[PDB]
Design a protein around this ligand. Structure first.
Ligand SMILES: [Mg+2]
Ligand SMILES: [Mg+2]
Ligand SMILES: [Mg+2]
Ligand SMILES: [Mg+2]
Ligand SMILES: [Mg+2]
Ligand SMILES: [Mg+2]
Ligand SMILES: [Mg+2]
Ligand SMILES: [Mg+2]
Length: 1310
RNA sequence: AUAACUCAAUUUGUAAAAAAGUUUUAGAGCUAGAAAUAGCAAGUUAAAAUAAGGCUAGUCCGUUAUCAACUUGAAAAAGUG
DNA sequence: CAATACCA
DNA sequence: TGTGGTATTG
DNA sequence: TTTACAAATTGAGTTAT
């Protein structure tokens, strides 16, 4: 009797019920509650709206951060624990004074001076050590016995802020020396061509505070006859951390583009050295050394002969220079600009020095402020020099201290420990403990150190001790934990669910892939009548001769190196492989290079061992654990080989198990899968064939060896945003089926709808750096500017034309074109992957295809450079160069066209599967499923084109009806489509020369609706005779449906979750709005939080005390229960409310009111709950469809439409009138309405297009939900808010089911 | 439609870490003047907190997902036009 | 208790 | 961006 | 801000059920 239409979105689900003749039914539904109404008429069409479902990222970030905080605190605790006794002998209350430092003097239990406990000693301390780094340096260098408190302070300061762990090994803090060394190995390599390094200050040039490239050019500038692109130049550039290509230096064909910071460098250099010889290893090693020394050089900036604390010395340098320069600046301003002195050094709100030190001004803002002040005056040259160096008036605690490795803090810590252990025995006994406190780090592959109460943890205990940094290796089972880290995420073999999957780089797996690809190769020569398979002997010969001697195997190598040299063929045609084999034996060659024993690798006896080794290399990444794991094989190799093996690492997992590949044997033959791959008589059967062959036993054994709705939907792949929509639409369908008397629909039609700046700037920076371009230095940008498409494309194309080979102009982007690589008539692609910036799109070649062969030939190399620089992707490149591969065939065109109407997205298929499996649950006499309900999926293009062809226009900003209308149209068009063409069920319905034909077929699939293109008035199906569409009266029905005033729009009521409030930590203030950051921290003294989020409101009817005498007065109001207060209120609401001050609370009248709670008042006017103290607009403006269509036409053959617009331009005043009466009845914002009427009367002189486009903006005044601002023409209209929820307390509350068809209304007159 | 492999791109989920920022306190302000108020000297650092907190007491957990109303029911869930 | 600006 | 909390203004 | 890891998914290709 009926079908269902569905439109699934990220913030909405549209639904509709249709009958046989495309009508939507209307029904009487019962109304519950305490009001007048017993029932209500409802149309069976509507839409559910909801806030976006969120990902789990933020929660994760905060969680991990939390853990870091508690662990840091623990570190400090360990330290103090060690210091306890001996500190008790010296100062009874030192640690207590430390821990209560935050407290106001009034609340302190001890003296207000932290370190010593009296004014004179404290002032003395600060006088001697103005910063902590002074004390650090003192304690590192001096030999005197020191106060235990200062020792503690230094150690604790080093431990609390320890630095990163991005560098492995030990650091011992130079550049001149290693530079001389590089020159040495260079000149000792190139005797005929020497370099003169005399008078060259390598230290000042390389450690200079400049960009790496500039410094490179500075160094090269001191070398005559030497250029930056030369070998030595590339070595220095390697040391500066650029991306040099040593190809041109060594006449290579393979580009030696090698970056030092890149993780693959250590293998890139082996790959390169294997080509030019091993004499050159010295050189590159020296280069790396110099690179390290340079890195240490941006960090330290102080001679290592003065002290063993270069870092602290550097901070002290910052201090001294800040002092001197501050004195200088003060004097200068005193002399020359005496009127600006107060502004600069006294006002915190002005970004001067005062705002820099005492205000919220950053170093960048401060530098911005004094730049023209320094420029305007005289004697401020070097100050400007330091300003451009970002080295002017530096603080010591700065944003750029993230460079500091933990090894140097560790260096100072160790030095201090060694220094003072000569006086304090406990420092001697606890040196390594403290060092480990700074050093220890929980491995990422271990996870939280939990004991059964963490859903995130996986680590296994080797003993039931409390875990400390010092007993970690003995208590934690590192191996089992590291293994569990991987195995809890990896797949099992689908075919054998109890078997683990092999490593992707396993030798056996690669043998499998190579043989599987090899088995389906065929060849023909002159003498043979038909192409033949490769035999077992041939396959083995090819493997041994080609696959075991070459990294990759090409077709040419197959022909020449095999078919010519062995089979004696001068010519042969091959069909199994393209250009070169996809599979290869990479691990075989890796291990061949490492262990240097082909016979060992070829011996079948060593199979298990090699598999275990590769497994170890894959499963782990820790070199120590890898080493311990490989110990059982230490007797088989030399120590050198053992270390090389240690360095070798792999990642990634296969798809099949070892038991599937080479374990299970066929009962009759006794052969495994791999055995069949290597030899199978005449029929070289595939893995797919072996697995499905009824004459073998594999299929038998495999078939032998073989989640609620919410969980199922949650486990799908996709954004949680769309998943929310999926669950919601399932629930909607359930309710609709319930409404229809528990009868199932005939059909269900579903349609599914289709920061970054940082990533963009990153892409462009790395790309340009790879390209070695200067365009970034010549044309500097900001990430916010890259939001512009043409500019982003400009930088991605290195400021060149993508079709012509010429430079473009940044200032002329408005004259250029953005062309689509594959025409948008075929591929609806809006991404950068299908877009390109060119001067004129006519230069692309033909507009009917991929860019011409001419262009491809002209630009291929440039595109290659862009590819290697990651400025374009592989897909973009392949699309750009398709013309040399025959361009777009007709098959491709037909395919694209059919893809424009046939959904292929996996997630939608999952939706259809869920619905289908929920509806059809019965099987027939042949044990086959009975499909009572047909689930159809369409793309949005069908309904969109339908609306555009018969003028059922959509304007989103008028109201929310368009979702529901979309669902309806989905149902109609879908059912009609399959009723007309029952053959297309394979394409649209869930479950189990010609190119031109398919093209024209799919391109005119929707022609049966049209009356002329010339077709009959009544459209039926040829075989059945059943009428599918009546052009005379069905369009009328659709038009009546879209014109229906009442449509069930329901905003999902949701409890608010998340953070308690704004994170801002505010200063103290006299306001009850402030919230304590800790239990005893009175916010009037300490400041705290502000602006909490209400989880849900609550209706309270009770009494409150009034006046001095506390007279009980009856009240009725809304109380906002915050997220922080929720658990307490839910534990015992009465006690909570009474604690709030309420008395004699009517417990049974307590009503929970989440956000978006709906209330109705007088003239059909509605409000939604935005908070406990604010409301949202609750009504929908049902504008008559004539006005919607008129607006659509006016705001955007065409001449008939223009004539319609001009003949009906009086519609404007009518639309304004409708908006006006609606606003007067429901919105109640007279000031804004006056502004609107006035502004509209102002621009009544403007063209019709413009007036329509700006009338579009006016609907935000009447839109459902939260009020917002909008510009009519140039007049901004500020939002009017509903800052009181009082009127709601006497309105009628409305409880709605998911469709809004079931209602319970409560008159809040109590 | 499905399976294995090659190349690339995207998305989701988890763990271990760094540097800032903010807040209160501690870095004896000095003179003149009864008084607000002038004139000048100064500033770079540190401690502690970083969701209130919880029991399961761990070097653990605390911001995702999920949620009309009513009848029941501790609760989970069923039922109701 | 408006119009209303600023904030995260 | 959008939108609910807050102090200020009257 | 940095490091380490797994899984789908899309889409250009080779071979199959
Ligand atoms: Mg805490
Ligand atoms: Mg030179
Ligand atoms: Mg600071
Ligand atoms: Mg190939
Ligand atoms: Mg590994
Ligand atoms: Mg939530
Ligand atoms: Mg800080
Ligand atoms: Mg509801």
């Amino acid at each position: 009797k009926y079908s269902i239409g569905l439109a699934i979105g990220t913030n909405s689900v549209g639904w509709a019920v249709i009958t046989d003749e495309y009508k939507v039914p209307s029904k009487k539904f019962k109304v519950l509650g305490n009001t007048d109404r017993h029932s209500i008429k409802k149309n069976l069409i509507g839409a559910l709206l909801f806030d976006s479902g969120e990902t789990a990222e933020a929660t994760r970030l905060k969680r991990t951060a939390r853990r870091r905080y508690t662990r840091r605190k623990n570190r400090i605790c360990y330290l103090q624990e060690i210091f306890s006794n001996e500190m008790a002998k010296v100062d009874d209350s030192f640690f207590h004074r430390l821990e209560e430092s935050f407290l106001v003097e009034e609340d302190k239990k001890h003296e207000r001076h932290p370190i010593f406990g009296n004014i004179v000693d404290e002032v003395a301390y600060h006088e001697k050590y103005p910063t902590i780094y002074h004390l650090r340096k003192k304690l590192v260098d001096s030999t005197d016995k020191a106060d235990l408190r200062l020792i503690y302070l230094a150690l604790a300061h080093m431990i609390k802020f320890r630095g990163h762990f991005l560098i492995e090994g030990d650091l011992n803090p130079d550049v001149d020396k290693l530079f001389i060394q590089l020159v040495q190995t260079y000149n000792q390599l190139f005797e005929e061509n020497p370099i003169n390094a005399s008078g060259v200050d390598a230290k000042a040039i390389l450690s200079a505070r400049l960009s790496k490239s500039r410094r490179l050019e500075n160094l090269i500038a001191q070398l005559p006859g030497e250029k930056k692109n030369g070998l030595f130049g590339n070595l220095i550039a390697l040391s500066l951390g650029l991306t040099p290509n040593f190809k041109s230096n060594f006449d290579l064909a393979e580009d030696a583009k090698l970056q030092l910071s890149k993780d693959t460098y250590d293998d890139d250099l082996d790959n390169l050295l294997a080509q030019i010889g091993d004499q050159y290893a010295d050189l590159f090693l020296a280069a790396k050394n110099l690179s390290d020394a340079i890195l240490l050089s941006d960090i330290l900036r102080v001679n290592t002969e003065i002290t063993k604390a270069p870092l602290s010395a550097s901070m002290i340098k910052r201090y001294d220079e800040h002092h001197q320069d501050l004195t200088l600046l003060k004097a200068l301003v005193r002399q020359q600009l005496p009127e600006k002195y107060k502004e600069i050094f006294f006002d915190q709100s002005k970004n001067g020095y005062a705002g820099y030190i005492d205000g919220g001004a950053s170093q960048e803002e401060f530098y911005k402020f004094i730049k023209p002040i320094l420029e305007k005056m005289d004697g401020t040259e070097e100050l400007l020099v330091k300003l451009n160096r970002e080295d002017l008036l530096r603080k010591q605690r700065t944003f750029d201290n993230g460079s500091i490795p933990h090894q140097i803090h560790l260096g100072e810590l160790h030095a201090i420990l060694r220094r003072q252990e000569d006086f304090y025995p406990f420092l001697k006994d606890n040196r390594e403990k403290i060092e480990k406190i700074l050093t220890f780090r929980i491995p990422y592959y271990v996870g939280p150190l939990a004991r059964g109460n963490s859903r995130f943890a996986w680590m296994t205990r080797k003993s039931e001790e409390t875990i400390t940094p010092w007993n970690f290796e003995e208590v934690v089972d590192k191996g089992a934990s590291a293994q569990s880290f991987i195995e809890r995420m990896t797949n099992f073999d689908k075919n054998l669910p109890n078997e683990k999957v092999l490593p992707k780089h396993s030798l056996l797996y690669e043998y499998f892939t190579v043989y599987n690809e090899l088995t389906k190769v065929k060849y023909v020569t002159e003498g043979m009548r038909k192409p033949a398979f490769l035999s077992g002997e041939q396959k083995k010969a090819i493997v041994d001769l080609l696959f075991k001697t070459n990294r990759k195997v090409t077709v040419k190598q197959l022909k020449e190196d095999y078919f010519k040299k062995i089979e004696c063929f001068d010519s042969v045609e091959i069909s199994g492989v393209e250009d070169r084999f996809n599979a290869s034996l990479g691990t075989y060659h890796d291990l061949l290079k490492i262990i240097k024993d082909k016979d060992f690798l070829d011996n079948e006896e060593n199979e298990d061992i090699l598999e275990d080794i590769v497994l170890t290399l894959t499963l782990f990444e820790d070199r120590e654990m890898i080493e311990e794991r490989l110990k059982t094989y230490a007797h088989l190799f030399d120590d050198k080989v053992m270390k090389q093996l240690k360095r070798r690492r792999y990642t990634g997992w296969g798809r099949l198990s070892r038991k599937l590949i080479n374990g299970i044997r066929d009962k009759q033959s006794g052969k495994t899968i791999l055995d069949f791959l290597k030899s199978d008589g005449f029929a070289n059967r595939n893995f797919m064939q072996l697995i499905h062959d009824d004459s073998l036993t594999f299929k038998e054994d495999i078939q032998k060896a073989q989640d609620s709705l919410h969980e199922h939907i949650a486990n799908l792949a996709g954004s949680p945003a769309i998943k929310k929509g999926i669950l919601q639409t399932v629930k909607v369908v359930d309710e609709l089926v319930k409404v229809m008397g528990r009868h199932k629909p005939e059909n269900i039609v579903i349609e599914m709808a289709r920061k970054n700046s940082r990533e963009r700037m990153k892409r462009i920076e790395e790309g340009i750096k790879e390209l070695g371009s200067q365009i970034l230095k010549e044309h500097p940008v900001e990430n916010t500017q890259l939001q512009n498409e043409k500019l982003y494309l400009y930088y991605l194309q290195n400021g060149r034309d993508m079709y012509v080979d010429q430079e473009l102009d940044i200032n002329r982007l408005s004259d250029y074109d953005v062309d689509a690589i594959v025409p948008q008539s075929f591929l609806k692609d809006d991404s950068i992957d299908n877009k390109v910036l060119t001067r004129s799109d006519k230069n692309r070649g033909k507009s009917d295809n991929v860019p011409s062969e001419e262009v491809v030939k002209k630009m291929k190399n440039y595109w290659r450079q862009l590819l290697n620089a990651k400025l374009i992707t592989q897909r973009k490149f392949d699309n750009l160069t398709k013309a040399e591969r025959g361009g777009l065939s007709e098959l491709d065109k037909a395919g694209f066209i059919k893809r424009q109407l046939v959904e292929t997205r996996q997630i939608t298929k999952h939706v259809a599967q869920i619905l289908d499996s929920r509806m059809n649950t019965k099987y027939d006499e042949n044990d086959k499923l009975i499909r009572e309900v047909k689930v159809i999926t369409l793309k949005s293009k069908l309904v969109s084109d339908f609306r555009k062809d018969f003028q059922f226009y959509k304007v989103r900003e008028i109201n929310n009806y368009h979702h529901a209308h979309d669902a309806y149209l989905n149902a109609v068009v879908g059912t009609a489509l399959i009723k007309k063409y029952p053959k297309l069920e394979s394409e649209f319905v869930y479950g189990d020369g010609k190119a031109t034909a398919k093209y024209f077929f799919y391109s005119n699939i929707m022609n049966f609706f049209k009356t002329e293109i010339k077709r009959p008035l009544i459209e039926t199906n040829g075989e059945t005779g059943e009428i599918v569409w009546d052009k005379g009266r069905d369009f009328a029905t659709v038009r009546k449906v879209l014109s229906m005033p009442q449509v069930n729009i329901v905003k999902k009521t949701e409890v608010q979750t998340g953070g308690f409030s704004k994170e801002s930590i505010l200063p103290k203030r006299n306001s009850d709005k402030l919230i304590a950051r800790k239990k005893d921290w009175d916010p009037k003294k300490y400041g705290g939080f502000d602006s909490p989020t209400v989880a849900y409101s609550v209706l309270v009817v009770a009494k409150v005390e009034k006046g001095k005498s506390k007279k009980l007065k009856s009240v009725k109001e809304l109380l906002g229960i915050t997220i922080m207060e929720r658990s307490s209120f839910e534990k015992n609401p009465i006690d909570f409310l009474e604690a709030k001050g309420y008395k004699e609370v009517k417990k049974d009248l307590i009503i929970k009111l989440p956000k978006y709670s709906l209330f109705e008042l007088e003239n059909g006017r509605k409000r939604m709950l935005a908070s406990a103290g604010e409301l949202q607009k609750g009504n929908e403006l049902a504008l008559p469809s004539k006005y919607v269509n008129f607006l659509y036409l006016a705001s955007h053959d065409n001449e008939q439409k223009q004539l319609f617009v001009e003949q009906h331009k009086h519609y404007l005043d009518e639309i304004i009138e409708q908006i006006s009466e609606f606003s007067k009845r429901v919105i109640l914002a007279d000031a804004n309405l006056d502004k609107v009427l006035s502004a509209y009367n102002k621009h009544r002189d403007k063209p019709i297009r413009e007036q329509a486009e700006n009338i579009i903006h006016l609907f935000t005044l009447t839109n459902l939900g939260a009020p917002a601002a909008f510009k009519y023409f140039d007049t901004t209209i500020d939002r009017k808010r509903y800052t009181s929820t009082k009127e709601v307390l006497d309105a009628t509350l409305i409880h709605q089911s998911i469709t809004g068809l079931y209602e319970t209304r409560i008159d809040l007159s109590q």
